Motif scaffolding. Structure first.
Motif, PDB file in Angstrom:
ATOM      1  N   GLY A 326       0.810  -1.204   0.000  1.00 56.89           N
ATOM      2  CA  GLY A 326       0.000   0.000   0.000  1.00 56.89           C
ATOM      3  C   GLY A 326       0.849   1.261   0.000  1.00 56.89           C
ATOM      4  N   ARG A 327       2.168   1.097  -0.095  1.00 54.98           N
ATOM      5  CA  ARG A 327       3.088   2.225   0.036  1.00 54.98           C
ATOM      6  C   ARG A 327       4.187   2.311  -1.011  1.00 54.98           C
ATOM      7  N   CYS A 328       4.192   1.423  -2.001  1.00 60.28           N
ATOM      8  CA  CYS A 328       5.243   1.473  -3.002  1.00 60.28           C
ATOM      9  C   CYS A 328       4.676   1.819  -4.370  1.00 60.28           C
ATOM     10  N   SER A 329       5.517   2.374  -5.237  1.00 61.96           N
ATOM     11  CA  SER A 329       5.094   2.761  -6.577  1.00 61.96           C
ATOM     12  C   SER A 329       4.944   1.551  -7.494  1.00 61.96           C
ATOM     13  N   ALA A 330       4.387   1.762  -8.679  1.00 62.56           N
ATOM     14  CA  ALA A 330       4.216   0.692  -9.665  1.00 62.56           C
ATOM     15  C   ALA A 330       5.550   0.037 -10.025  1.00 62.56           C
ATOM     16  N   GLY A 331       6.558   0.876 -10.271  1.00 67.51           N
ATOM     17  CA  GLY A 331       7.887   0.414 -10.631  1.00 67.51           C
ATOM     18  C   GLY A 331       8.611  -0.325  -9.511  1.00 67.51           C
ATOM     19  N   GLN A 332       8.484   0.188  -8.289  1.00 69.08           N
ATOM     20  CA  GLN A 332       9.055  -0.462  -7.123  1.00 69.08           C
ATOM     21  C   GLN A 332       8.494  -1.864  -6.936  1.00 69.08           C
ATOM     22  N   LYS A 333       7.187  -2.011  -7.137  1.00 66.86           N
ATOM     23  CA  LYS A 333       6.497  -3.302  -7.023  1.00 66.86           C
ATOM     24  C   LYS A 333       7.041  -4.309  -8.013  1.00 66.86           C
TER      25      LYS A 333
ATOM     26  N   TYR B  34      11.368   9.838 -12.131  1.00 69.07           N
ATOM     27  CA  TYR B  34      11.798   8.456 -11.887  1.00 69.07           C
ATOM     28  C   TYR B  34      10.770   7.625 -11.151  1.00 69.07           C
ATOM     29  N   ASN B  35      10.983   6.318 -11.128  1.00 67.38           N
ATOM     30  CA  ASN B  35      10.219   5.439 -10.245  1.00 67.38           C
ATOM     31  C   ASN B  35      10.186   5.981  -8.802  1.00 67.38           C
ATOM     32  N   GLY B  36       8.996   6.075  -8.219  1.00 66.96           N
ATOM     33  CA  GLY B  36       8.896   6.496  -6.837  1.00 66.96           C
ATOM     34  C   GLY B  36       9.034   7.993  -6.621  1.00 66.96           C
ATOM     35  N   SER B  37       9.062   8.785  -7.696  1.00 68.08           N
ATOM     36  CA  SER B  37       9.160  10.238  -7.560  1.00 68.08           C
ATOM     37  C   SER B  37       7.999  10.774  -6.752  1.00 68.08           C
ATOM     38  N   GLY B  38       6.809  10.228  -7.019  1.00 68.37           N
ATOM     39  CA  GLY B  38       5.568  10.735  -6.454  1.00 68.37           C
ATOM     40  C   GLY B  38       4.558  11.170  -7.511  1.00 68.37           C
ATOM     41  N   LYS B  39       4.715  10.705  -8.742  1.00 68.87           N
ATOM     42  CA  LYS B  39       3.817  11.146  -9.807  1.00 68.87           C
ATOM     43  C   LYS B  39       2.401  10.638  -9.597  1.00 68.87           C
ATOM     44  N   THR B  40       2.255   9.364  -9.245  1.00 68.88           N
ATOM     45  CA  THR B  40       0.924   8.799  -9.047  1.00 68.88           C
ATOM     46  C   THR B  40       0.212   9.448  -7.863  1.00 68.88           C
ATOM     47  N   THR B  41       0.986   9.918  -6.881  1.00 65.23           N
ATOM     48  CA  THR B  41       0.406  10.599  -5.730  1.00 65.23           C
ATOM     49  C   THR B  41      -0.380  11.825  -6.174  1.00 65.23           C
ATOM     50  N   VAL B  42       0.167  12.515  -7.164  1.00 63.69           N
ATOM     51  CA  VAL B  42      -0.463  13.717  -7.665  1.00 63.69           C
ATOM     52  C   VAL B  42      -1.877  13.395  -8.157  1.00 63.69           C
ATOM     53  N   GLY B  62      -3.002   4.476   7.502  1.00 68.40           N
ATOM     54  CA  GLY B  62      -2.569   5.815   7.148  1.00 68.40           C
ATOM     55  C   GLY B  62      -1.432   5.778   6.149  1.00 68.40           C
ATOM     56  N   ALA B  63      -1.480   4.791   5.259  1.00 66.40           N
ATOM     57  CA  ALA B  63      -0.469   4.655   4.230  1.00 66.40           C
ATOM     58  C   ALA B  63      -0.431   5.896   3.354  1.00 66.40           C
ATOM     59  N   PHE B  64      -1.578   6.538   3.169  1.00 61.60           N
ATOM     60  CA  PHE B  64      -1.647   7.766   2.377  1.00 61.60           C
ATOM     61  C   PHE B  64      -0.993   8.962   3.050  1.00 61.60           C
ATOM     62  N   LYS B 416      10.533  15.086  -8.337  1.00 67.53           N
ATOM     63  CA  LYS B 416      11.826  14.616  -7.834  1.00 67.53           C
ATOM     64  C   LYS B 416      11.796  14.289  -6.344  1.00 67.53           C
ATOM     65  N   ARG B 417      12.802  13.552  -5.878  1.00 71.51           N
ATOM     66  CA  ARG B 417      13.067  13.414  -4.446  1.00 71.51           C
ATOM     67  C   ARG B 417      14.194  14.387  -4.063  1.00 71.51           C
ATOM     68  N   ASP B 418      13.991  15.211  -3.035  1.00 77.37           N
ATOM     69  CA  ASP B 418      15.050  16.129  -2.607  1.00 77.37           C
ATOM     70  C   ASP B 418      16.086  15.372  -1.757  1.00 77.37           C
TER      71      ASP B 418
HETATM   72  N1  LIG Z   1       2.821   6.859   3.835  1.00 81.10           N
HETATM   73  C1  LIG Z   1       3.969   7.055   3.181  1.00 81.10           C
HETATM   74  N2  LIG Z   1       4.976   7.674   3.829  1.00 81.10           N
HETATM   75  C2  LIG Z   1       6.125   7.886   3.182  1.00 81.10           C
HETATM   76  N3  LIG Z   1       6.454   7.565   1.930  1.00 81.10           N
HETATM   77  C3  LIG Z   1       5.441   6.943   1.312  1.00 81.10           C
HETATM   78  C4  LIG Z   1       4.194   6.659   1.852  1.00 81.10           C
HETATM   79  N4  LIG Z   1       3.396   6.026   0.914  1.00 81.10           N
HETATM   80  C5  LIG Z   1       4.162   5.944  -0.152  1.00 81.10           C
HETATM   81  N5  LIG Z   1       5.412   6.468   0.023  1.00 81.10           N
HETATM   82  C6  LIG Z   1       6.483   6.527  -0.968  1.00 81.10           C
HETATM   83  O1  LIG Z   1       6.105   7.470  -1.945  1.00 81.10           O
HETATM   84  C7  LIG Z   1       6.286   6.942  -3.276  1.00 81.10           C
HETATM   85  C8  LIG Z   1       4.963   6.915  -3.989  1.00 81.10           C
HETATM   86  O2  LIG Z   1       5.114   7.665  -5.198  1.00 81.10           O
HETATM   87  P1  LIG Z   1       4.379   7.185  -6.530  1.00 81.10           P
HETATM   88  O3  LIG Z   1       3.540   8.369  -6.977  1.00 81.10           O
HETATM   89  O4  LIG Z   1       3.592   5.890  -6.297  1.00 81.10           O
HETATM   90  O5  LIG Z   1       5.580   6.828  -7.511  1.00 81.10           O
HETATM   91  P2  LIG Z   1       5.582   7.085  -9.050  1.00 81.10           P
HETATM   92  O6  LIG Z   1       6.161   8.394  -9.375  1.00 81.10           O
HETATM   93  O7  LIG Z   1       4.141   6.953  -9.557  1.00 81.10           O
HETATM   94  O8  LIG Z   1       6.521   5.916  -9.626  1.00 81.10           O
HETATM   95  P3  LIG Z   1       6.151   4.741 -10.607  1.00 81.10           P
HETATM   96  O9  LIG Z   1       4.688   4.279 -10.357  1.00 81.10           O
HETATM   97  O10 LIG Z   1       7.127   3.563 -10.310  1.00 81.10           O
HETATM   98  S1  LIG Z   1       6.466   5.371 -12.432  1.00 81.10           S
HETATM   99  C9  LIG Z   1       6.972   5.583  -3.139  1.00 81.10           C
HETATM  100  O11 LIG Z   1       8.357   5.652  -3.451  1.00 81.10           O
HETATM  101  C10 LIG Z   1       6.726   5.187  -1.677  1.00 81.10           C
HETATM  102  O12 LIG Z   1       7.877   4.515  -1.172  1.00 81.10           O
END
Ligand SMILES: Nc1ncnc2c1ncn2[C@@H]1O[C@H](COP(=O)(O)OP(=O)(O)OP(O)(O)=S)[C@@H](O)[C@H]1O
Ligand SMILES: Nc1ncnc2c1ncn2[C@@H]1O[C@H](COP(=O)(O)OP(=O)(O)OP(O)(O)=S)[C@@H](O)[C@H]1O
Ligand SMILES: NCCc1ccc(S(=O)(=O)F)cc1
Ligand SMILES: NCCc1ccc(S(=O)(=O)F)cc1
Ligand SMILES: [Mg+2]
Ligand SMILES: [Mg+2]
Lengths: 432, 432
Positions: A326-333, B34-42, B62-64, B416-418
């Motif tokens: 519930g906390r990792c991105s698509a790519g991380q998974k 990049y993977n895990g940047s936070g794009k899907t969060t947006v 509270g994963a969100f 990005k990640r800072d």
């Molecule tokens: N509750 C949380 N607290 C801290 N970090 C979190 C939490 N939930 C998710 N994350 C991190 O935030 C990132 C989620 O960003 P995403 O938007 O899913 O990544 P992304 O940019 O869509 O990358 P992809 O899907 O691989 S292209 C992941 O790297 C998680 O490790």
DNA sequence: CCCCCCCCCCCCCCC
DNA sequence: GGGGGGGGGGGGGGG
């Protein structure tokens, strides 16, 4: 263990008339092709050949069998043949057949026909079994791989390749299978039953012993005979007591060996996972991932001690550790699931270098595409000489192919394409 | 009509101290990282702001919410702000707040704090509502798009983007949600109640009339008798008329609903058919269609509700088969996107709003190129009408190149990640 | 009559 | 279908 040649007839987009074949290389079998060409089907046929398991959501309604309407017949026969060599020199072929009928009422019915595992000696045939129940057993037994490993790790379906990142109950199910946890609790439990039974006998025996002792003091038939039965019963008591301890100590030994085996295994798995993650993952945000195991124990004199493993994949950053679910991105998974399967393959079948990676760069960015490929190249280089590896990679990712530098290992690759009739065909190509 | 500015604070990888913002362009907002940047969060926060729904698998633990452990504090408050313009010019901002506590018992619990819908008269803020239950209703009305469309189609979670290809019941539930059948079927049942009640009155009335006819015939005070006969007869006809009016109203309502269902499925399949032929590189699938099967007989849940079954079919030559259990990974990804584009175009034809999160998943080079070119054609065609707001997240470089964003963009966004591993949103310029 | 707050219900979600 | 958490709703109370 080694897989040599696969034959596919009438499965999905492969037509029912002319079998298509692929021969597997060492250390690497590369399979490319367009969307819908039939690459994943190839791995479906390997899983079916080795385990009899059909693809999920395709087990009924004959989705697996080339559809009768496309060919113009009301019946289609599917066949999959796999030739392989066991851990010892021996040479086998497993054949499986499945049938699909369209009745006059349009109703479709799927039937599993007879299959056969047959041994080839010097190139000449002998039948080992023609019963589908034993084939599953026999092939994995000959290959040197548990069925739970074939299913989850080696020939994992593309639609199922993210199972390591699934919900806890599901994750647990697959680890419970892989560790055969149901089997060993049944061992522990049977011994416990036997121990309780011998315990009931002992109560009765001690009664009798007290009784026969008293008759001897009274006789002290006759005192010579009175001593005989007293002794007979005394020995049964002492013999039973010893049996009770032995069952008890054995019960403990089994439980202890099982618990330590699990620890060692998990320690190895997490090591490989840590190495694979630190080498390949380009992100700064996750330093490593680990599989954490929480044991739940329930202890009672009636149920003894029964252990239940709960499992979690956590990601480690600095001091902090969080559950990835519930906390990792698509790519991380995608990356975590590949690495975990590699780690399991290495720990659970340390010596058969066999795994299928169907489209490993799903959702991966450019950096991770590169590093994954270079890590795969690194795994191959390390184990190529040992002759261990038969690795199958499916991809249409051109960036990935370029960085893998596979030409060092390959003289050829296989391309799956659709012909004019739209049938899947497998053509061998020069590495050029 | 349009979404203008989004603000994210303490959600997932976004830190809790300083909010990040993104502004949406017309016709296209490009987001890379990049993977895990936070794009899907947006995209999640867009969904959350508009509907209050959290990402799947994240409503618990509270994963969100950005994890309290990462900061060194025991409590984190998250906030998401979205500013937008209604179908009419009017300017709004909806704010929502969420808290995640590490409790006296050690494991985390999340709580939903106060929210607000705020109306902007330039230079004056006005609270239209602070009802977190009411925000959903108000926002969707102002945007001009249904809640189920925001959920399944516009802001569909990346983990859920293949729902069109899911199991029949799952597909059905979503089409059901999208087709609000409950409100009107209950209308019909209440009319039916009245119609039946008038039916009973009619039975009693017809009786009494026969009685009054005989009395009139007996009189042949005769004038009195003819009066009563007429009086009773006119009551009979009036009731018949009332029965007919209720009946006709019931049918008009039901007919209107079946017509709506047919009309939409027709347009939806038209659009899907053009997109497939236009976008899909491959000879094996000529078109795809959504089939709607009606359950012969409507089930009674406080009304008579029709049960539709839906299936996605692939068409090649004469033959048609269900895609479920039969299509490749890439085919699932392409079919799901096209179906969503079609659902947006038919169901909220007026506002061109959709988010495509990593649209080239498992796509080959040709399908990546053609998908990019199809989007380009969609954008070119509708850019003038100003309707279109397309949000694309990608790290596929071959895809970006064929997209030719410079034609539509003056800037794009990078996530990005800072140094502290916090997500940041940086705006960058493009030449054209 | 409006609503505000708390605790509790019940509801959606996830199992 | 059930179980649990949390959101929301419900009812009582006050503004
Ligand atoms: N509750 C949380 N607290 C801290 N970090 C979190 C939490 N939930 C998710 N994350 C991190 O935030 C990132 C989620 O960003 P995403 O938007 O899913 O990544 P992304 O940019 O869509 O990358 P992809 O899907 O691989 S292209 C992941 O790297 C998680 O490790
Ligand atoms: N029962 C069936 N009869 C005929 N064709 C079928 C049947 N089941 C599936 N197919 C088709 O056969 C193909 C199977 O190909 P796959 O092995 O899934 O393709 P792929 O090479 O893995 O492509 P990807 O996953 O997008 S890279 C698909 O294109 C299906 O449309
Ligand atoms: N089937 C190959 C398993 C394997 C074998 C070796 C490694 S490595 O971490 O030591 F490079 C990783 C995975
Ligand atoms: N949101 C609308 C998406 C859409 C979908 C299809 C088209 S078409 O012109 O190619 F038929 C245009 C726009
Ligand atoms: Mg595939
Ligand atoms: Mg994502």
């Amino acid at each position: 263990s080694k897989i040599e040649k696969l034959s596919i007839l009438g499965v999905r987009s492969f037509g029912p008339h002319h079998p298509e074949t692929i021969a597997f290389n060492t250390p690497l079998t590369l399979i490319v092709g367009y969307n819908g060409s039939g690459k994943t089907t190839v791995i479906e046929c390997l899983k079916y050949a080795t385990t009899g398991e059909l693809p999920p959501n395709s087990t009924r309604n004959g989705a697996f069998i080339h559809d009768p309407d496309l060919v113009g017949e009301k019946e289609v026969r599917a066949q999959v043949k796999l030739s392989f060599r066991s851990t010892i020199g021996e040479s086998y072929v497993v054949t499986r057949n499945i049938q699909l009928l369209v009745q006059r009422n349009n109703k479709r019915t799927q039937k599993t026909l007879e299959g056969s595992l047959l041994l080839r000696n010097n190139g000449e045939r002998t039948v080992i079994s023609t019963r589908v129940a034993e084939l599953d057993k026999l092939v994995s037994e000959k290959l040197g791989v548990p069925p739970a490993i074939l299913d989850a790790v080696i020939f994992c379906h593309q639609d199922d390749s993210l199972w390591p990142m699934s919900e806890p109950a599901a994750l647990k199910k697959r680890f419970d299978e892989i560790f055969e946890a149901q089997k060993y609790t049944k061992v522990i439990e049977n011994i416990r039953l036997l121990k309780k039974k011998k315990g009931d006998e002992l109560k009765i025996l001690k009664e009798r012993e007290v009784q026969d002792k008293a008759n001897k003091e009274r006789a002290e038939l006759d005192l010579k005979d009175a001593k005989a039965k007293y002794k007979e019963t005394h020995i049964k008591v002492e013999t039973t007591k010893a049996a009770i301890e032995d069952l008890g100590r054995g019960m403990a030994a089994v439980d202890h060996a099982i618990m330590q085996y699990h620890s060692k295994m998990m320690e190895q798995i997490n090591r490989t996972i840590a190495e694979l993650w630190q080498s390949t993952y380009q992100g700064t945000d996750i330093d490593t991932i680990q599989i954490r195991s929480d044991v739940e124990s329930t202890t009672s004199s009636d149920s003894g001690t029964r252990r239940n493993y709960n499992y979690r994949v956590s990601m480690v950053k600095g001091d902090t550790e969080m559950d990835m679910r519930g906390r990792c991105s698509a790519g991380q998974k995608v990356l975590a699931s590949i690495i975990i399967r590699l780690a399991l393959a290495e720990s659970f079948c340390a010596n058969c270098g066999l795994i299928a990676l169907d489209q490993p760069t799903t959702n991966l960015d450019s950096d991770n595409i590169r590093s994954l490929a270079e890590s795969l190249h690194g795994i191959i280089k390390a184990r190529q000489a040992q002759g261990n590896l038969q690795l199958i990679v499916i991809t249409h990712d051109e960036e990935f192919l370029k960085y893998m530098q596979c030409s060092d290992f390959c003289d050829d690759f296989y391309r799956v394409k659709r012909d004019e009739k739209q049938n899947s065909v497998i053509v061998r190509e020069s590495i050029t």
